[PDB]
Amino acid sequence: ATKAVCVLKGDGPVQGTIHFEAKGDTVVVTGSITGLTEGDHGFHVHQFGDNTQGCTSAGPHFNPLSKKHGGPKDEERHVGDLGNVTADKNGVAIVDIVDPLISLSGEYSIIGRTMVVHEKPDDLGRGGNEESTKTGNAGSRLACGVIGIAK
Amino acid sequence: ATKAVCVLKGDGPVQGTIHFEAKGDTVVVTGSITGLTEGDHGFHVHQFGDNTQGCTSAGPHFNPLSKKHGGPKDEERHVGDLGNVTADKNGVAIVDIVDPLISLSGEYSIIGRTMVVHEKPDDLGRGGNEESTKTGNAGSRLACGVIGIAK
Numbered sequence: 001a002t003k004a005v006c007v008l009k010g011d012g013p014v015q016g017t018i019h020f021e022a023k024g025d026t027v028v029v030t031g032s033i034t035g036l037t038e039g040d041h042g043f044h045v046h047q048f049g050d051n052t053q054g055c056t057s058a059g060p061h062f063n064p065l066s067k068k069h070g071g072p073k074d075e076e077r078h079v080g081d082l083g084n085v086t087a088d089k090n091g092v093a094i095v096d097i098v099d100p101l102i103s104l105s106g107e108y109s110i111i112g113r114t115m116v117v118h119e120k121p122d123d124l125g126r127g128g129n130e131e132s133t134k135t136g137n138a139g140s141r142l143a144c145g146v147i148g149i150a151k
Numbered sequence: 152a153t154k155a156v157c158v159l160k161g162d163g164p165v166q167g168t169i170h171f172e173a174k175g176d177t178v179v180v181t182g183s184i185t186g187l188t189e190g191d192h193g194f195h196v197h198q199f200g201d202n203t204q205g206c207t208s209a210g211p212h213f214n215p216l217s218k219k220h221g222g223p224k225d226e227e228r229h230v231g232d233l234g235n236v237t238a239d240k241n242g243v244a245i246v247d248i249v250d251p252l253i254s255l256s257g258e259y260s261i262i263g264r265t266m267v268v269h270e271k272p273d274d275l276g277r278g279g280n281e282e283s284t285k286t287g288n289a290g291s292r293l294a295c296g297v298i299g300i301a302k
């Protein structure tokens with residue numbers, strides 16, 4: 001696809017709508033999330049578009065290259081690693097990202113996978129431990145959605 | 152993918168989990184639905200995995216080859232026309248479909264689009280009006296979900 005979309009729901013106050021658009025070989029991710037506690041939350045494309053167990057069955061991060069966990073800019077990162085999104089004091093987060101690694105077709109295509117917002121900030125793989133190299137220690141999954149074709 | 156999955160939700164009693172698997176040049180589609188009234192209900196793949204306005208934003212049937220609506224057997228159908236599932240007296244429909252037209256990859260991939268279960272029976276394009284040739288007069292979209300990649 002050239003355009004896709006994601007509606008984030010959970011069993012909490014955290015809702016959002018994430019928009020995806022293919023520009024050459026980057027994905028412009030745009031949107032907002034509401035209900036967040038102030039500050040950073042990890043923002044990851046997890047592997048499966050599977051909601052049979054809420055956000056739990058989305059699996060780990062989309063990582064077809066078997067890299068370590070990392071931030072959007074690091075060479076060592078999962079493809080699904082889109083780093084942190086920041087909520088203001090009103091709990092709202094404008095999403096604004098241009099990523100050349102995730103995509104909306106071919107392999108690395110995120111279509112039909114799961115966009116997750118996390119309870120905790122992502123330490124971007126740079127942490128005193130080994131969960132850091134897996135999840136960035138972004139903690140729980142607050143809200144998630146299957147990324148579907150929009151246009 | 153070679154497997155996908157779909158959680159049917161709406162604002163209603165109706166809910167279901169639909170399982171797709173690539174089997175040779177066919178997709179076998181299995182699962183169950185509940186909450187329905189008895190007898191036949193249309194069961195279609197709609198074009199957009201766009202859940203922003205619930206099932207409404209899914210759009211029309213997946214129809215990349217611009218054919219008029221039909222039943223899954225017809226020369227002339229949409230790729231999304233999987234026909235009817237039948238609810239027994241207890242509101243329960245056991246899904247069991249193998250289709251040669253829909254795919255989990257390539258052109259015709261149904262990953263990222265929407266599975267919809269309708270209010271009324273599809274008429275397979277054999278009503279006598281425009282609504283037959285587009286919709287099957289299947290009625291309102293009771294429950295839908297986005298088709299995601301499954302382990």
Ligand SMILES: [Cu+2]
Binds near residue numbers: 043045046135138
């Ligand atoms: Cu994550």
Ligand SMILES: [Cu+2]
Binds near residue numbers: 193194212267269286
């Ligand atoms: Cu339909």
Ligand SMILES: [Zn+2]
Binds near residue numbers: 061
């Ligand atoms: Zn990661």
Ligand SMILES: [Zn+2]
Binds near residue numbers: 229287
């Ligand atoms: Zn149709």
